[PDB]
Amino acid sequence: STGSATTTPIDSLDDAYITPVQIGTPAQTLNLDFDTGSSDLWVFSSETTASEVDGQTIYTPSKSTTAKLLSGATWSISYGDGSSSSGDVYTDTVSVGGLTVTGQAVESAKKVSSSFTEDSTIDGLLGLAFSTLNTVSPTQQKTFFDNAKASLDSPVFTADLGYHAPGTYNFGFIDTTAYTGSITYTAVSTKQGFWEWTSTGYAVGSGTFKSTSIDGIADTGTTLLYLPATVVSAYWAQVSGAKSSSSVGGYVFPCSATLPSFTFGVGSARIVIPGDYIDFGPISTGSSSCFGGIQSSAGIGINIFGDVALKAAFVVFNGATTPTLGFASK
């Protein structure tokens, strides 16, 4: 089997991407944030505290003939941005882009933090990291990809995120028309539960490539690119007037600037992030100070190849017995 779904930016900044997901019988379509940095599929639901729902589409298990309460199971998750959610668990039929999994754990939110309530466009998350991170207790549950894997033509999924435009998540095949040149594959460590890999270096604009190992995770659920302070400083030093602002929470730059590209290494290959991808616009409406798309990972504890980086590439998440990651230009 295979699946193919379009993913769509939630706003003009590509702050996140949503992908339609069918849950239940008859289908209940929710728009979920596919997150290769977590491993819970959770949704806004009929069980979610009423005051914490504001515009989202909810899953109603009682209207699904294939829904079954997973007795005794609860879940609770906190994300890197400080947001959180929790609730109980159903099993139900879940389909993505024509690919169907029966008995998928669907984690029904009883509580969500403000950040989720305030974002009317995201109805939940679908995690695509390794199932060892799944928070369901007392019986840990598998991700959608884990459940689908054995049935897929090839045990892979691909992320093809657009810049200010729709893109595609494919399951079970590699669309050879969707990228240019070759796919360069690189080793993955699953030790922390993530799609963790080591970049071979970086360049700023038309500058020379610095060979240096950067360990990080491929995380579709994180908006920006978080790298070591040394790297980030070298980038923003090439932008007149750029500075790190503690009051804003990172590097800002004059909105009148032309941003340089940023290149990262994948083995001997190079992925180029155009300067425009690194612009996240005014810090507040009408401001002439703009927020940077490359930020320091210092105090996150991990480097994160988020959407700013991934959308510059066609990315293969290879879930073979020994997982790998592939990157191609497109």
Render the burial of 92-126: b for 16+ CB within 10 Å, e for the rest: bbbbbbebebeebbbbbbbebbeebbebebbbbbb
> In terms of residue numbers, what domain contains 26?
5-174
Whether 302 and 318 map to the same domain: the answer is yes
Q: In this structure, what token pair is assigned to residue 108? A: 């029904």
Q: Which residues neighbour 309 within 8 Å (Cβ) at sequence distance 6 or greater?
A: 225, 264, 271, 273
Query: If you ran DSSP here, which 8-state letter would residue 45 be given?
Result: B
| Structural domains counted in the chain | 2
Q: What DSSP assignment string belongs to 115-164?
A: HHHT-TT--EEEE-S-GGG---BSS----HHHHHGGGSSSSEEEEE--SS
Q: Per the residue annotation, which of 38, 95, 199, 297 is the catalytic one?
A: 199
Whether 94 and 213 map to the same domain: the answer is no
The C-alpha atoms of residue 45 and residue 56 are separated, in whole angstroms, by 9
Query: Please, which residues bridge with residue 202 across strands?
Result: 210, 264
Whether 310 and 212 map to the same domain: the answer is yes
The C-alpha atoms of residue 46 and residue 52 are separated, in whole angstroms, by 11
Whether 77 and 200 map to the same domain: the answer is no
Q: Per the residue annotation, which of 14, 33, 35, 123 is the catalytic one?
A: 35
Whether 165 and 210 map to the same domain: the answer is no
Q: Which residues neighbour 254 within 8 Å (Cβ) at sequence distance 6 or greater?
A: 239, 240, 241, 242, 288, 289, 290
The C-alpha atoms of residue 67 and residue 199 are separated, in whole angstroms, by 42
Q: What DSSP assignment string belongs to 124-137?
A: EEEE-S-GGG---B
Residue with tokens 């399951």: 171
Q: How many CB atoms lie within 10 A of CB 189?
A: 14
CA 53, chain centre distance (Å): 22
Query: Please, which residues bridge with residue 159 across strands?
Result: 169, 315
| DSSP H or E stretch at residue 114 | helix 114-117
Asked if 171 and 145 count as a contact pair (C-beta separation under 8 A), the reply is: yes
The C-alpha atoms of residue 158 and residue 4 are separated, in whole angstroms, by 10
35 is catalytic: yes
Whether 114 and 238 map to the same domain: the answer is no
Q: In this structure, what token pair is assigned to residue 20? A: 């339609």
Residue with tokens 């379009």: 6
199 is catalytic: yes
User: Cα angle at 258 between 257 and 264, to 5 degrees?
Assistant: 125
Domain finish residue from 174, 206, 230:
174
Give Cα separations from 33 to 9, 212, 225 (angstroms). Answer: 10, 32, 18
User: Cα angle at 217 between 120 and 100, to 5 degrees?
Assistant: 55
Q: How was this structure determined?
A: X-ray
Q: Which residues neighbour 285 within 8 Å (Cβ) at sequence distance 6 or greater?
A: none
Burial of 285 (0-12, 13-18, 19+ CB in 10 A): exposed
- Position 24, amino acid: G
Q: CATH number, domain at 185?
A: 2.40.70.10
Query: Please, which residues bridge with residue 282 across strands?
Result: 290
Whether 27 and 90 map to the same domain: the answer is yes
Whether 138 and 194 map to the same domain: the answer is no
Whether 182 and 295 map to the same domain: the answer is yes
Whether 296 and 217 map to the same domain: the answer is yes
